[PDB]
Amino acid sequence: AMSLENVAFNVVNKGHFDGQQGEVPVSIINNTVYTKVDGVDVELFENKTTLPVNVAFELWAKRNIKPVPEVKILNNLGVDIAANTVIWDYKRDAPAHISTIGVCSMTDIAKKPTETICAPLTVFFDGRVDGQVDLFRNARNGVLITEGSVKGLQPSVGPKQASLNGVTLIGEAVKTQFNYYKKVDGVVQQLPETYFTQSRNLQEFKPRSQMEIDFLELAMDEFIERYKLEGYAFEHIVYGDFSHSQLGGLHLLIGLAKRFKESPFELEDFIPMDSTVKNYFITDAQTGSSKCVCSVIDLLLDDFVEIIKSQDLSVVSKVVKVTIDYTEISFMLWCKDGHVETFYPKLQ
Amino acid sequence: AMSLENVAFNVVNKGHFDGQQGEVPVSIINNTVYTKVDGVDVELFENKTTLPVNVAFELWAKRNIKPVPEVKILNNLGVDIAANTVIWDYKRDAPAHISTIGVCSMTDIAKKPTETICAPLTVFFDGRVDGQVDLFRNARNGVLITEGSVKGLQPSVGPKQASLNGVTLIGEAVKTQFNYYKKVDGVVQQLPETYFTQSRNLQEFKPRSQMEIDFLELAMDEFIERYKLEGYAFEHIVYGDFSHSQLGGLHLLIGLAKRFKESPFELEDFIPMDSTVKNYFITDAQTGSSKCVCSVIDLLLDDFVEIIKSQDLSVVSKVVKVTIDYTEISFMLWCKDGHVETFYPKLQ
Amino acid sequence: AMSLENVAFNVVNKGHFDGQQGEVPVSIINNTVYTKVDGVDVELFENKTTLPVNVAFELWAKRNIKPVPEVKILNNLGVDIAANTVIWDYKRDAPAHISTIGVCSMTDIAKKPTETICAPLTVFFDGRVDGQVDLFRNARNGVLITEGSVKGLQPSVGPKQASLNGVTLIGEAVKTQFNYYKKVDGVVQQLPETYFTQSRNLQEFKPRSQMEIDFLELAMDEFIERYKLEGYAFEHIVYGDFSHSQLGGLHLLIGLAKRFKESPFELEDFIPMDSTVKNYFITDAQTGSSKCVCSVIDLLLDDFVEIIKSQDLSVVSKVVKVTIDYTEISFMLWCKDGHVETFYPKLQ
Amino acid sequence: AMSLENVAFNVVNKGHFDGQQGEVPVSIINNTVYTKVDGVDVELFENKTTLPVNVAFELWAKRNIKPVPEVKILNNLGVDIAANTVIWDYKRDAPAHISTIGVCSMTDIAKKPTETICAPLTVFFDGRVDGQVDLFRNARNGVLITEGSVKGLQPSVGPKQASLNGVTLIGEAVKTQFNYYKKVDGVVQQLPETYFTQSRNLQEFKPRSQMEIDFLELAMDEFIERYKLEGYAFEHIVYGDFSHSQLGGLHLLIGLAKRFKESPFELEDFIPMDSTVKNYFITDAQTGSSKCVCSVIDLLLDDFVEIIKSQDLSVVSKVVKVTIDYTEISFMLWCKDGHVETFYPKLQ
Amino acid sequence: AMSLENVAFNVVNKGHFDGQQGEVPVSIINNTVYTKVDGVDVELFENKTTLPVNVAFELWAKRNIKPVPEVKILNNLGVDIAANTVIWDYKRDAPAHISTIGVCSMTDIAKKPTETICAPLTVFFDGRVDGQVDLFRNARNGVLITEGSVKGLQPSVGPKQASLNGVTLIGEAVKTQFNYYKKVDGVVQQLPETYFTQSRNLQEFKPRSQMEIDFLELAMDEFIERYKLEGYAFEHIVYGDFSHSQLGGLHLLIGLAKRFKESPFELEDFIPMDSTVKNYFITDAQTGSSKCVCSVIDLLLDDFVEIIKSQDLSVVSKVVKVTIDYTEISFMLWCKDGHVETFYPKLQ
Ligand SMILES: NCCCc1ncc[nH]1
Ligand SMILES: NCCCc1ncc[nH]1
């Protein structure tokens, strides 16, 4: 027996929806859910979604609290809906998916993913839940994650990191690296070879290779010399050029993290959502150098070096396609006299 | 187990809260409660109260659906709260009382009127509900209504009419005339002798005596002659004077109803609530004669004639107090040479 | 190039969306759309839907302005969505369907009904629009209306009335009687033989047969005598019993219209939407007789007489299923000694 | 000392702002102003304007309660703002003008119309207020109304009717016919000779000449014969043609009032404001004949007959400009063989 | 003469309500109060309370700006209301109490605490205000704070810290340590022996004893050895166990502060209010170890050591009650073979 008061009871006593019986007094005002605690109203939830406040509150309470794939991975794999869970999108403060299956009476399109309404949708299945590997085997369209091997199915090793309650982390106490599987029209897909973005933050950026440690510690000319990067325009692309009114390059998160230690800058996240490539309106506070659309990707510096060193540098401009997070990312590569001028994730 | 979904289930299936088990999906957006009916949202309630939308919806669903005293009578008797019911104020589209007793977890100050918090409040008790006469006997402060005799308790015969689902009526299939009782500080109070307002509408006004039939049918000068009303200023007070920019008199509802048949006028109800005396900003459409504060009372014309004919007409101006609906209504009486000039409910 | 300003330009200059080029300044505040007219804001639309204000405004502007089936008929036939039009539900002040096809970028699930997303949905097709009969022939699920014969397709003669801009009418200058067709899972479905509700209002009720003229003019006992209705409980079912606290019978709109001429009553439409059977919380103003859930259906009195006279009256209680507006309506029939006690649309 | 609480005190005790000292407790929630009356909240004002709720409440409380020109006349004369008053637009439930002069601290652009900010604005002045004729004489731009002669100023006799608290009326107890004067760039402007619209409603339409009495009582062919209107297409223009899907003509309010007595129709006022010519999306309920943009003007039938009989009928199509309510109204006149086919206020 | 404009004038010129005369222009939009400063709107207050925006703005302006007891202390002492002040709850951004006494006309239940409505309520009295010690002496129910001795009354030494404008601090320039007194039904209570929580923040945690300095500086095994804490499960309870998917222990704020220096973690404050024990949904960013309901108390480590070393360790599980901040806190104590396994504030 689902109810607003029961959802609020679960949030108050269990920190989230935990199927417990009970009710607390609730008041809804505008887009906020409150509960009465000893005579006064205490805020439980502020709706930042486009769904009705009581519906968003229920989906948020019913969010998956285990490490789950980051929303950008699910989106890149064409995931439409999740089987009997809510993947909460912490970047948008909203459900990752419009509809649900066996979660909430207002958003449910089905109670089980075997209902014919789900057959054309790519349903997310989680092998850590009993019966979901079997549901994926019988589903026409779906994406499955598992911690280990699935008999007969060939896996795709996913990223090392996963999202746990909005914290992206590489699990030590929990497993965050999943095997991925995908089916389109009843046929198990062969997921492509892919690089993965590292999902790091600017303020707490940590290197994940000796090359990344060297990038952060060494001076620009020492690093470029050590890794034989002359002619690859890392001065522009990675370090950034703050000498003109338009900020040059600065498309790799590691370069922004290095700059951030020396001096701050504003990053306007004008489309705030999870995506493989992010676009920011950047203003460098020290110089006043700025760029309306600065595309930024967090690749491991070694992967970015491998990508740029695997390109033909004989044409003025061309599109370089790279599978990253299972999706095809277009980069614009500009060359002159056999050397790179710029290389950036395409603002298409 | 009270819940928003259960309240909505009761509204959808029973027309109001009826203690039935069940749930319907609900969505709350802004101040409106909706339910899903075959794929689309259907409005169940629009909150016009100052309470949270889900709380007002529950109180409205739990409204008393038996004939109950009109809110003006309850207000006049000093009723603060009701015992285990909601008196819905249809004139304000809101609960008649801020708090509840044994109704709703958000508004309840107690579950039973015997709780010490209720002792200073004048609690409304309904003798038609088992145990409520006994609860009145043990209450420090309260107002009780009954359909019959209570042993040892001296009654006050209330008005003929009561409100049933917002319709004021004199019951034929149901009893609407109640005995009234009141207690203050543990002591039974003698309710005063009183007139009662008739609670009629302008558009569907019906006469309730031969004098009222004669007022509506006869011309002004022949009605005044027939009932020997010369010198009582009925021309001004009751018929109304539309000859000057300021509308003169027009303080009896019957006079407004007579005028309404001939020509329309605007009545701005600038304090829209139930009260013994109503104030309107009136604009006569035919003449343009208007008055910002025109006090209007719906007394039976015979009662108004009895009141005005029982006054001493020897002083220029004085306050005449008349008990109406259990409250002392102040009237301003203006005389000249032994005749009335005006008589109106005194604008406080 | 669709835009809020272009939609508002069309509303201001064409009375609705008419595909015209142009823009007017618009301001959105809360749930209302305004436009500037010579310096001041003028309201164009107040959103009463659960969709975003600018989206609801666009769907309302793009509403079908030809006579279309009443929403209750579309709901009864299982219509989920319309092909390249918006059926505006004037009873709910909202789109009849959640999603659109080729109408609005925010609500569209497809641009054409041939897209695979539309295959499981019952799409409404209108033969008066070029190519829509062909689209119905190729659709997996759908309901089609036409003004004439479709080769090889067996028709179902629909109701005489249709809705034109929220006015239900039997067209004289326009055709409102359509042929109906339906497909389920790619297979043309035979629509059942059905009665149709008359879609009349209480305040402007007009008789549509000599029996209905006689019901409204004749006294109860002489109408029952003239039409040999003794033993069919029309006194209870149709005329209504206002003698007890619970209002008895009163399930036919014509009986409510007859009562309405004599004395008024309140009809609380607690689920305000279009449906074959309506439920009202009724309070009779004259007697105080009331009923929380009074099911009411507007059948032609002759059709109701035909239905009730075609039943076996030998059992205490039973369910009688009658096809009305293409839906199976359950009725509860209560008998005693070979006579009817009551017959009413069964409260589900 | 202006304040929200003082404005509310004035509304509660005086029916509007009357400069009285005092305060009442107020609560603002969403767009509604409430006051506490014996423990419960009572609604004083619901903001339907695009201004902040407390600001709109103050302007509405400070509305002019004397007969004032109808907003369409003020708009037609180019009035931007009023001197030390608020002209409340009852058709829009909003101030007729965005800014104020000496009324409200939030909307004031000046305290007196002599401030240089008012020089480019056409300020409305009211000769019934002391000093306002002198203020008009010194204003660069303005419109003045008076009840009598202003020395040396040539007057324009305005309409017979004025708006008093939202009621348009021809005053008997008050004067509603004003002399009008206008200044542009410091120069007194000669107001043109004009017809005036009658400002009548469909439901309470009253004839104002013997020709109008004859139009409403006589049959179409005998009225046309009596007034020698053969060849002037009154059958189409005034009576209306309900025979085709598109409703023909019906551009004079009197014709809509005649039709209304026989059968109802829907008039969608899609730009709800006061204007000389109104546009409606009309749906005739009896026939289903409809028109998205039906321009309607309320001229005295005699004035419309005078206008149409003063035109040259020798050209297929042409624009006929007629001064109505001080504005040039364009009409489209279509002729064939020396007879009128149609004549309507040209849809701009 | 209280008013919205006067409250706003005080906020603009005095930083809070200071009883100064004056008015500023104000606009209210949604839940925000603005004032016009040289032509533009400037935000003064955003309502995060469940009260009307203008009422919450007034109570916030009238907040107590002296050091006052933290809301958790007032709540633990059963405080219902304050005498002639507003205790602003900075953790909820709302008044600590629903009603007021002599503060605001919308929330006042009385002007003075001697009114009979206040007699059953526990009124907060402040000895720093003239006459409030005497008001406490005559009150039936109340809590009094003083800086020094009250003749005849025995004091309870309160916490060292108090809240000054939402900053919890141990005053050096001001006195924050108060004597507490409480009366229930006219009887001066003997307040129990109690520990006090330290009200520290995670980010700016400072040790308040040599044991706390040693906890933060020393390694886990060195500290446990130095203070002879073997067998008391400090490894689990205080340091925290981040090795399993469920985060173990971590119930003392000092342990969270130590962890915070090494690596960050998310603390979801799902019931955001002031309380002796706080519950957080914690996610450790380094390991991914998490716990839905991690109860956390900020006790001085010496007090926690004294509490845990004063328990009988011979039973598997039992409830240990400890008076903290004047309230009874239940702890769950789990033992095995004479050693502690866990000890935590009970999630009841
Ligand atoms: N954000 C949801 C993506 C779902 C999808 N992918 C392709 C089509 N639909
Ligand atoms: N948060 C207010 C507490 C007041 C109280 N304590 C006990 C009863 N009421």
UniProtKB/Swiss-Prot annotation, chains A, B, C, D, E:
Catalysed transformations (reactions): uridylyl-uridylyl-ribonucleotide-RNA = a 3'-end uridylyl-2',3'-cyclophospho-uridine-RNA + a 5'-end dephospho-ribonucleoside-RNA
Record: active site: 236, 251, 291
Domain (Nsp15 N-terminal oligomerization): residue spans on this chain: 3-63
Domain NendoU intervals: 206-345
Domain AV-Nsp11N/CoV-Nsp15M: 64-189
Marked site (Uracil recognition site) residue numbers: 295
Outcome reported for the amino acid change (mutating residue 236 to A): Complete loss of NSP15 endonuclease activity
Domain of life of the native organism: Viruses
Positions of uracil binding: 291-295, 342-346
Localization per record: Host cytoplasm, Host perinuclear region
Annotated site, Transition state stabilizer, chain positions: 291
Official protein name in the record: Uridylate-specific endoribonuclease nsp15
Species in which this protein is naturally found: Severe acute respiratory syndrome coronavirus 2 (2019-nCoV)
